[PDB]
Write a protein that binds this ligand. Sequence first.
Ligand SMILES: CC1(C)S[C@H]([C@H](NC(=O)[C@H](N)c2ccccc2)C(=O)O)N[C@H]1C(=O)O
Lengths: 99, 248, 50, 487, 49, 148
Amino acid sequence: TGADAQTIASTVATPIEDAINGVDNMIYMDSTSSPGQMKLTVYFNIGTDPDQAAIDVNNRISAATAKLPEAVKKLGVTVRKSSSTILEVVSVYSEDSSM
Amino acid sequence: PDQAAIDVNNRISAATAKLPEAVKKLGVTVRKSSSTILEVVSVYSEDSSMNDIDIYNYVSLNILDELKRIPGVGDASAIGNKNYSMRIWLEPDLLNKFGVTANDVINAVNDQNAQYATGKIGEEPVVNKSPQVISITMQGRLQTPQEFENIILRVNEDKSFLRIKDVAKVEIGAEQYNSTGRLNTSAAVPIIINLQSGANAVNTAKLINEKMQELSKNFPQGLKYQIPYDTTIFVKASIKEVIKTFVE
Amino acid sequence: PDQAAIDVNNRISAATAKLPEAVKKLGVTVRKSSSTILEVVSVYSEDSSM
Amino acid sequence: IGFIAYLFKIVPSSLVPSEDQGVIMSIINLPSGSSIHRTIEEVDTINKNATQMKEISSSVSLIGFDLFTSSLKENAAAVFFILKDWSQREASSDQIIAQLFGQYAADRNALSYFLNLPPIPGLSLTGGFEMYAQNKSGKDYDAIQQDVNKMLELARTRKELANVRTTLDTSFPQYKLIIDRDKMKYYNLNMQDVFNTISATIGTYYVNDFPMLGKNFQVNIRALGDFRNTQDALKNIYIRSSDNKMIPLNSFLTLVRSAGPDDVKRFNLFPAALIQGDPAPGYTSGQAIDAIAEVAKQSLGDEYSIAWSGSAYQEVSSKGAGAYAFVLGMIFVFLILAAQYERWLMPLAVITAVPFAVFGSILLVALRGFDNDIYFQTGLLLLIGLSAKNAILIIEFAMEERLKKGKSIFEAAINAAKLRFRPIIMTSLAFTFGVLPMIFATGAGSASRHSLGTGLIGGMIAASTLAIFFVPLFFYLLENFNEWLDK
Amino acid sequence: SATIGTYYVNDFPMLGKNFQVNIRALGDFRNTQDALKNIYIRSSDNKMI
Amino acid sequence: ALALVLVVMYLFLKNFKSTIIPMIAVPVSLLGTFAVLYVLGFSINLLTLFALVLAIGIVVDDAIIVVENIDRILHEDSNISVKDAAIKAMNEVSSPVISIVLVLCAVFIPVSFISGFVGEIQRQFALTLAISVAISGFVALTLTPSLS
Ligand SMILES: CC1(C)S[C@H]([C@H](NC(=O)[C@H](N)c2ccccc2)C(=O)O)N[C@H]1C(=O)O
């Protein structure tokens, strides 16, 4: 939090991106840095089992957590499978101004 | 081969906390590698226009990353370990004169060569709204040796700033000067590839050759890759011998 | 049990934030477990010196 | 057959038909750096006008989130305008989109793009390449985009490339903090400490977690926004010296107006910019990929490098597998009908029956104006096979007449065709009429229904109207040739 | 560890990557057994030992 | 389509009892397709559903070709009984039908080998069609003549 994309790309994205490199069945990696947030989506060869891809990425990342700045470590790194799609969107709304 | 890695990794994570801090900062790596050399690729400057420190760096950044990605490569490592590092060569006779310990240099560099967090201007919640949200950016990591030299250890009260330049010499050298590599008689960087467990050597060997051909097209003038030691060569050769025997 | 373990570890990893910091620092451990006790071995000093 | 290839060339090749999903996504981006309050006002103006239109029943909005470049940008905001049921609204999504575009066509505070939701999620309808220009020399992102805008100008000259665009934007306002390290040190201040003060006052500092409702929640410290809004915010912030002296931040720190990239992108472990492009309507997707690669290598420096993502990646890394498989499939079909007829030459007659079906399908789509979509291709698989089935039967029955009943080569080709007349008519009649509702289908999935349907109807009609007369002619020729060989 | 050995303090930006900073002494000063005598540490009472 | 087939079965074959045979056969030839689609990783999605519409075609054609040819032979000879007629016609068409199922599947499997996102889309359609031709053809071989 509170870091510019250039800082987050050099300080956070670069260490993580390097560790995940070489993970099996990985075709390419893409990372975008925005102030305060780093999003890095690994892309894997078609037919790779998601559960196996996720666990590998997680392994490699937990080795490079320590290199990361402390503020980032305090909040930690989230690894998820993004293969999912949106079934539906449910918007809870305050019709009134009471919430 | 893959579940073993997961199991080894899962069990190591609890141990990783217990490990010494320096070890954990450098990281601990669990890779499914046999540790038996599939092949050694030698990238060398024929022109001699590139010094060994530079050649190593080119093959780390441009070639090694690509070879690690290739399917069937557990790990590809160049032997020299001469990756760039800013090296601050302390001289203990100048440190002793200016009354500075090594530790005061270590503390100074950590504090003055880091990038920290600076927030945005105009962000909400603000009562008096502003037209724009502007983000403060900072550069706190020095990129040059002349900048590293100017890190300030102490203010000498004449407002003279004792700096690294005074107690030490800074240069961009290499992280480890321990090992080198040679091809024939000349110097080269050796990239040793270990096969991932459970993968075909012949297929991986052919893939590494084809990636290297593609990479070679972009090589800076004066760079040749040779792969002198390849294990699969014998295997493929014996396949050809038995094919000839079949015809005969 | 091996694939079940992967799916638990992956789900925990996704919920990094929900966890409090102190648990993160120590780490969370996901390991296959079995409650069956095949046997209990008891080692004793006949001498009782130990 | 020549006409088939003329028709195949004139019909546009499009991946999947654009379809009304009922939602009219709207991306609104204000100028770079715009505060959320400006963006919210704009969203509000956009949505009350939309309320006026009957078709748009409700509207969901996501202020501060840029849909295109997933990220939280205050200037950006997306307003999805939910439409009414297909059966309740006469106007199509496209018509409503035009009305929205027309009202906002005038220059205003924001720029709005109105689009229908992607037909198939996770897939670009375009044949566009995504190319990442990785920088191996360490040049700064601002320098990177001046290099890439040059790539862009060369790209727009080339014919194959169309709509070439880049994601990188260095336009966003930024403040550069200049640190006088001479003063900071002299003031006996440590650099980490002077940034902890900035992180607490100007930005948000998360010290520790507090318990609430059974779930730990963050404790954060930031200053009243009245103080943060102005550039001289720095002057009210103070840091203690090691000599216990309050020293204002503005002394050793200066904020300078600057422009820089809000979103920094690194691809494959290298700093990168993303170039998206579309193929030229005439040119193929593969040709476009090759063209941009050439442009990139000359315009960009040797220090740059080019990598591919998504569809482009697969095309570059393609083993030509489909081609080998198709050749094998044909050879297998050849042989399996050779076995049935016990003649090497005879299965050629069956393979000749196939282009009549394919001709009906591509003719009708051309008249309709429908493109060569995936639906059309899948239609073909059925058409081909149905045509083949009919042909296999006509040929087999003909063989029987020639052999078992000793009929003449000419008489056999008349008898077989007439025996097989009725089954072909019956099946075609039932199926064509059965899939005729597709042509007239309205509602969700309508474009897809129409596309599959138009090809099917045309092919089925052709196979029953034309193929049946022709297949005996092929058989007649082959049987005559076999007899000639016997002589 | 910073005069006989190399101490990795932090990372410095070069070529779009992060490279280590290592503080080690000049070679001649770590070349002998009595290397230890050249090196000096300050105490709590600010006197070099 | 099922009703339209009945209309063609009724007008062309001039029998009302002949309509029952498609009615029993076509659902069986689609339920079978579903069962295989379950065994294989295939799910019901928009693209498979579109394929099912195409599949209707293969199934209807197979029933129509068999019934009609039996009726044709049953009308060619007054002396021939329905069961003899069925055997005759089946002997005539059994070999083509097996060849039809092999040829057709040879047409569809290469579509599955197409690489890229468009081949994944195309394979969902193709494989479903190939399943349909096989299940339909087995039914045409066994169930349809018996009902006839
Ligand atoms: C970023 C997206 C992946 S989300 C958007 C679209 N989203 C939806 O259709 C959501 N179900 C939705 C969001 C807001 C309002 C109504 C629907 C989709 O996923 O295709 N299209 C994409 C896009 O806009 O680039």
